Amino acid sequence: GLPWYRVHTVLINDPGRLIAAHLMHTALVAGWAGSMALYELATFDPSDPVL
Amino acid sequence: QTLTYDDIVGTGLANKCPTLDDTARGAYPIDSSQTYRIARLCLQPTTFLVKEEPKNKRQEAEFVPTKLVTRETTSLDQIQGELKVNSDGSLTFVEEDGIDFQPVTVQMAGGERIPLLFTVKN
Ligand code: CLA
Ligand code: CLA
Ligand code: CLA
Ligand code: CLA
Ligand code: CLA
Ligand SMILES: CCCCCCCCCCCCCCCC(=O)OC[C@H](COP(=O)(O)OC[C@@H](O)CO)OC(=O)CCCCCCCCCCCCCCC
């Protein structure tokens, strides 16, 4: 069987599922961005931009 | 004109004070021997401004605009009182009664709700 460190090589000759993997990576990064902003907005104090 | 309740109901006009033609720029003569009254005093707020808390370093607070959240429930009306003529010739209005208070909640930037008893009691 494939060793753990090679599981993603099953995509090397599978353009479609390579695209699917890339789409999922992009989904996760855009989601992170959205979640990070919402967290920051929930915690940000906007009342003193001087100090 | 002479409107009726059924003309006004639900339109938001019941919260509006009456108005005068743009050409009513005359003069009401005050006869000192006479005694006077306000038969109807109407106050319609149009803006609510709240002084922001200037932080410890401060410098100066401003009055910041706010958003009304309690709808067309804000006006004071049917207020009555005597208009006295003082001996120095000034006039003084002394409120007796009326619908002279409305609870109002406005909202500041950031979401703080600020209630107030908009009033001219006494
Ligand atoms: C971008 C991320 C990503 C993508 C697109 C893929 C895509 C793929 N993986 Mg890979 N994989 C990843 C991350 C990813 N993987 C990670 C991080 C690991 C380590 C766990 C693995 C381990 C792994 C194995 C062991 C296998 C694959 C396999 C595969 C293929 C089939 C899908 C599968 O069985 O997934 C299974 C993998 C997962 C379901 C990963 C889930 C990880 C979860 C979501 C982490 C969540 C933790 C926690 C809930 C976080 C919340 C906060 C916490 C504080 C509570 C496909 C090409 C299979 C394959 O084709 O092998 C040939 C396979 O057998 N992957
Ligand atoms: C876009 C960048 C990119 C891409 C697409 C790949 C893709 C690939 N790598 Mg390479 N690689 C990269 C960057 C990249 N690598 C970098 C930066 C390094 C240096 C660290 C390596 C070092 C490296 C080695 C040494 C090997 C590969 C191998 C492979 C193949 C199998 C990987 C696998 O199944 O892992 C499976 C992985 C898991 C099941 C779990 C991994 C969990 C890791 C340890 C931590 C998780 C971190 C976190 C979840 C997400 C990342 C955070 C941040 C980076 C965004 C696959 C073609 C293998 C190969 O050539 O096989 C033929 C292999 O042996 N990669
Ligand atoms: C028709 C011309 C064309 C165009 C416009 C693109 C555009 C793109 N390709 Mg390339 N591609 C082309 C032809 C084209 N490709 C050809 C002829 C091949 C050979 C088969 C490939 C093979 C290929 C691979 C293997 C991969 C790409 C990837 C990508 C995307 C990378 C950036 C991304 O995901 O942004 C982030 C995404 C967004 C901001 C949202 C995108 C929304 C757009 C407007 C698409 C809307 C739906 C649309 C109808 C679907 C078709 C897309 C188009 C590629 C055909 C990007 C959208 C990568 C990809 O898919 O990334 C996940 C990837 O893995 N392409
Ligand atoms: C330019 C930015 C960039 C780049 C180049 C990559 C590249 C990669 N990311 Mg992605 N990622 C990014 C930004 C980026 N990411 C961002 C901004 C986020 C949101 C926070 C994510 C979230 C994300 C997730 C959730 C996952 C990836 C995964 C991957 C890998 C998929 C291919 C693979 O099999 O690798 C094989 C893996 C390696 C070659 C390992 C490389 C190790 C890198 C350098 C990290 C070093 C170890 C890490 C710091 C240890 C974490 C410890 C911590 C838990 C305490 C690839 C290395 C997937 C992955 O790792 O699958 C296993 C995956 O699950 N990324
Ligand atoms: C519809 C498209 C779109 C738009 C308008 C935005 C807009 C934004 N994003 Mg989002 N984002 C999108 C798609 C989009 N995003 C997608 C598809 C993803 C998933 C990958 C993300 C993931 C994402 C993350 C992870 C983060 C954002 C963030 C942001 C903000 C800052 C952007 C920034 O600094 O980029 C800066 C981008 C660059 C500096 C890119 C540089 C490009 C390099 C140099 C590539 C050069 C290679 C090139 C091929 C060579 C060119 C040849 C040359 C000769 C022409 C902004 C609100 C940030 C934010 O505030 O989130 C809340 C943030 O942290 N975005
Ligand atoms: C979103 C977040 C999700 C994160 C997912 C979790 C991360 C994935 C798990 C990674 C753990 C790696 C375990 C691999 C461990 C393991 O599988 O090793 C044995 C493995 C042997 O591989 P072979 O090529 O023999 O293949 C056997 C296969 O069955 C493996 O699938 O070798 C490798 O993995 C190469 C890397 C060696 C790693 C060496 C580490 C040994 C260190 C021991 C010393 C410890 C310190 C003690 C001294 C102080």
Curated annotation (Swiss-Prot), chain A:
State its location(s). Answer: Cellular thylakoid membrane
Membrane topology, Cytoplasmic segments: 1-15
On the tree of life, the source organism's domain of life is Bacteria
Q: Where are the transmembrane segments?
A: 16-36
The UniProt similarity line reads: Belongs to the PsbB/PsbC family. PsbB subfamily.
* Subunit organization: PSII is composed of 1 copy each of membrane proteins PsbA, PsbB, PsbC, PsbD, PsbE, PsbF, PsbH, PsbI, PsbJ, PsbK, PsbL, PsbM, PsbT, PsbX, PsbY, PsbZ, Psb30/Ycf12, peripheral proteins PsbO, CyanoQ (PsbQ), PsbU, PsbV and a large number of cofactors. It forms dimeric complexes. Part of a photosystem II (PSII) assembly intermediate complex PSII-I; crystallized from a strain deleted of psbJ, it forms monomeric PSII before addition of the oxygen evolving complex. PSII-I includes 3 assembly factors not found in mature PSII (Psb27, Psb28 and Psb34).
Give a short account of what the protein does: One of the components of the core complex of photosystem II (PSII). It binds chlorophyll and helps catalyze the primary light-induced photochemical processes of PSII. PSII is a light-driven water:plastoquinone oxidoreductase, using light energy to abstract electrons from H(2)O, generating O(2) and a proton gradient subsequently used for ATP formation.
Name of protein: Photosystem II CP47 reaction center protein
Q: What is the lineage of its organism?
A: Bacteria, Bacillati, Cyanobacteriota, Cyanophyceae, Acaryochloridales
Gene name on record?
psbB
Q: Which residues of the full protein are shown?
A: 2 to 52 of 510
Swiss-Prot record, chain B:
| GO-annotated cellular components | photosystem II oxygen evolving complex; plasma membrane-derived thylakoid membrane
Q: Which UniProt keywords apply?
A: Membrane, Photosynthesis, Photosystem II, Signal, Thylakoid
Major place of residence? membrane
Q: Which residues of the full protein are shown?
A: 29 to 150 of 272
Show the taxonomic lineage: Bacteria, Bacillati, Cyanobacteriota, Cyanophyceae, Acaryochloridales
The record describes the protein's role as: One of the extrinsic, lumenal subunits of photosystem II (PSII), which stabilize and protect the oxygen-evolving complex. PSII is a light-driven water plastoquinone oxidoreductase, using light energy to abstract electrons from H(2)O, generating a proton gradient subsequently used for ATP formation. Required for dimerization of PSII and for binding of PsbQ to PSII.
Query: What is the protein name stated in its UniProt record?
Result: Photosystem II extrinsic protein O
Q: Which GO terms describe its biological process?
A: photosystem II assembly; photosystem II stabilization
This chain's source organism reads Thermosynechococcus vestitus (strain NIES-2133 / IAM M-273 / BP-1)
Q: This protein's superkingdom? A: Bacteria
UniProt GO molecular function = oxygen evolving activity
Family as reported in the entry's similarity comment? Belongs to the PsbO family.
Asked if the keyword Hydrolase belongs to this entry, the reply reads no
Q: Assembly and partners?
A: PSII is composed of 1 copy each of membrane proteins PsbA, PsbB, PsbC, PsbD, PsbE, PsbF, PsbH, PsbI, PsbJ, PsbK, PsbL, PsbM, PsbT, PsbX, PsbY, PsbZ, Psb30/Ycf12, peripheral proteins PsbO, CyanoQ (PsbQ), PsbU, PsbV and a large number of cofactors. It forms dimeric complexes.
Q: Cellular location of this protein?
A: Cellular thylakoid membrane
